[PDB]
Amino acid sequence: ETFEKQLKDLTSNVKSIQDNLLEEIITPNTKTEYLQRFLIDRFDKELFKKNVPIVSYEDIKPYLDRVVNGESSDVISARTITGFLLSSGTSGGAQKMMPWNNKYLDNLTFIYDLRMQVITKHVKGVEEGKGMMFLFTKQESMTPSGLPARVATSSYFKSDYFKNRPSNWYYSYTSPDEVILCPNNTESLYCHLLCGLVQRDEVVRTGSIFASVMVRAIEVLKNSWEELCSNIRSGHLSNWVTDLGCQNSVSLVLGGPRPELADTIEEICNQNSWKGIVKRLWPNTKYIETVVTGSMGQYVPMLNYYCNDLPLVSTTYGSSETTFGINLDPLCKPEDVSYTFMPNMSYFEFIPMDGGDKNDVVDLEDVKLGCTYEPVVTNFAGLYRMRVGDIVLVTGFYNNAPQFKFVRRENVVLSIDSDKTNEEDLFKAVSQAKLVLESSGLDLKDFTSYADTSTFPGHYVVYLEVDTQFELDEEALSTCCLVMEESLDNVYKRCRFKDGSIGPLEIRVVRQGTFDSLMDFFISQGAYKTPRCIKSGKALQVLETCVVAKFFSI
Numbered sequence: 409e410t411f412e413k414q415l416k417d418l419t420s421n422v423k424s425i426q427d428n429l430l431e432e433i434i435t436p437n438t439k440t441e442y443l444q445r446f447l448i449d450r451f452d453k454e455l456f457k458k459n460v461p462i463v464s465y466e467d468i469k470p471y472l473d474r475v476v477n478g479e480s481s482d483v484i485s486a487r488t489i490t491g492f493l494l495s496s497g498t499s500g501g502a503q504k505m506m507p508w509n510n511k512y513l514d515n516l517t518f519i520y521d522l523r524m525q526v527i528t529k530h531v532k533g534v535e536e537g538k539g540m541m542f543l544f545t546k547q548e549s550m551t552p553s554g555l556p557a558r559v560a561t562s563s564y565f566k567s568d569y570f571k572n573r574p575s576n577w578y579y580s581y582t583s584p585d586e587v588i589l590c591p592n593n594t595e596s597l598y599c600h601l602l603c604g605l606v607q608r609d610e611v612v613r614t615g616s617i618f619a620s621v622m623v624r625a626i627e628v629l630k631n632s633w634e635e636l637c638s639n640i641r642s643g644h645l646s647n648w649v650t651d652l653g654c655q656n657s658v659s660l661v662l663g664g665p666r667p668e669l670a671d672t673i674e675e676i677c678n679q680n681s682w683k684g685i686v687k688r689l690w691p692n693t694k695y696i697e698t699v700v701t702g703s704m705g706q707y708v709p710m711l712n713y714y715c716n717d718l719p720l721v722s723t724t725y726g727s728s729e730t731t732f733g734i735n736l737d738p739l740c741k742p743e744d745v746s747y748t749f750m751p752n753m754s755y756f757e758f759i760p761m762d763g764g765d766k767n768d769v770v771d772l773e774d775v776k777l778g779c780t781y782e783p784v785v786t787n788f789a790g791l792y793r794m795r796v797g798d799i800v801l802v803t804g805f806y807n808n809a810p811q812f813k814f815v816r817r818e819n820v821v822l823s824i825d826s827d828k829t830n831e832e833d834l835f836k837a838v839s840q841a842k843l844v845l846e847s848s849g850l851d852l853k854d855f856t857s858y859a860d861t862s863t864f865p866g867h868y869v870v871y872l873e874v875d876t877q878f879e880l881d882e883e884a885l886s887t888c889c890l891v892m893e894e895s896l897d898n899v900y901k902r903c904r905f906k907d908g909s910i911g912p913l914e915i916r917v918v919r920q921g922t923f924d925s926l927m928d929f930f931i932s933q934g935a936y937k938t939p940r941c942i943k944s945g946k947a948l949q950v951l952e953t954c955v956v957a958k959f960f961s962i
């Protein structure tokens with residue numbers, strides 16, 4: 409009742425909700441130093457549109473730095489900045505810091521409740537069970553202001569919005585809160601699975617924010633099931649888990665020896681093939697809740713294999729700037745997933761990214777079917793007309809609310825997990841290898857790359873065509889791998905050296921003429937610059953036939 413109406417109101421009243429939101433945002437902010445600069449002295453949409461510049465992160469980083477260093481929030485926001493969000497996006501190798509306050513949590517939990525309703529409208533059999541949700545709290549990074557920088561969901565978990573969350577199936581997990589709150593994710597992932605297994609009959613949903621993490625959970629399961637079952641059998645958690653909260657809370661889940669349940673799970677895990685393993689271990693699971701769009705699409709085949717084509721439900725599109733909105737057709741196929749922006753989240757504008765829309769910038773209500781755009785965000789934390797760097801495509805309309813397929817993050821050439829390595833990053837990394845090559849009597853002719861997920865964990869593959877005896881200097885080429893990795897950003901390093909979600913960077917040295925042949929291949933397809941990443945399977949086949957040596961970082 410209330411919900412059908414709530415969604416009707418949100419999606420029919422788009423222009424006026426957006427315009428009221430803008431006014432709500434701008435009015436108290438006229439006296440901030442940032443807006444004073446552009447003479448926004450009263451609210452007026454036309455003046456905001458004429459005088460407030462559309463900016464990139466780098467344009468306004470100087471203002472952000474000052475707040476990070478302890479200066480008054482009102483440099484940019486009359487609503488007090490009480491923390492920051494650590495973006496997966498980076499600047500000079502360091503994670504971007506976006507301003508944050510409780511409004512972010514009000515939006516987030518609003519979105520959680522809305523999508524909960526969307527899911528329950530379309531999926532039956534969930535209200536009595538729990539979810540085995542692979543949820544992780546990360547470590548924060550203190551800023552000189554005394555305000556912490558956290559990743560988005562951690563800013564939620566480390567708050568009473570989470571601790572005092574609603575008491576219903578959607579917020580009920582097989583893992584104790586202590587597990588979710590444990591900053592050691594090697595330990596918390598292990599515990600997630602153990603708790604999941606002990607309470608396997610109650611599991612009606614499983615998932616994680618992103619598909620990569622769901623895949624890693626299953627792979628870790630495949631690598632740990634013997635140990636997990638030993639804990640279940642004895643009723644004791646392995647000694648190696650150090651986190652006191654995990655020890656205490658998981659001890660209670662376990663309760664005592666469960667040899668019989670251990671036998672049951674071992675029998676399942678001992679089968680010939682891991683196919684359908686998630687459904688076999690968790691037979692009451694109704695769906696998998698995880699983002700399968702953007703670069704996460706690469707994990708869809710693996711997920712279907714492990715999950716016996718249980719529905720993959722991809723609910724939410726969001727960022728460090730703002731949550732955007734949700735998938736109002738949760739049971740659609742991963743390739744047809746679009747996200748309906750919610751007009752109460754932030755004020756949204758769009759920069760056309762093809763010829764289909766000749767305007768310079770357009771409101772949410774005005775985006776055209778079939779056109780791509782870059783979202784531009786004005787939020788409740790001191791970001792005004794901020795370009796987001798994602799490309800989206802309008803695929804439809806729910807009432808008056810446009811629905812958007814996520815196309816890509818612009819410039820990104822390599823992404824396995826949370827890492828997002830852009831073309832510039834790659835060029836820098838390759839540049840370091842070049843120095844190594846020069847220092848060993850070689851030079852680099854050309855290069856390209858590829859995100860390999862054919863094995864776990866996934867890793868970056870870089871093809872190098874070198875030029876000047878019986879053998880390649882393996883020490884030098886190994887060193888090339890190392891310097892490339894070392895030039896990458898903190899997010900890659902965390903995944904690689906702490907999460908183990910990314911494996912050693914691999915260099916594949918290719919034969920003389922490889923990249924000339926590559927060029928021949930592409931122009932035979934119709935076509936020039938060597939692409940900096942390859943996503944065509946045929947081109948990839950061409951490269952592979954050219955490989956003469958393989959090296960790995962470490």
Ligand SMILES: Nc1ncnc2c1ncn2[C@@H]1O[C@H](COP(=O)(O)O)[C@@H](O)[C@H]1O
Nearest residue numbers: 495496701702724725726727728814817
């Ligand atoms: N549902 C989704 N589908 C595809 N890409 C997403 C989704 N949610 C987030 N992303 C990507 O992750 C970025 C957010 O990074 P962050 O600043 O770390 O929160 C977005 O701008 C997108 O590039």
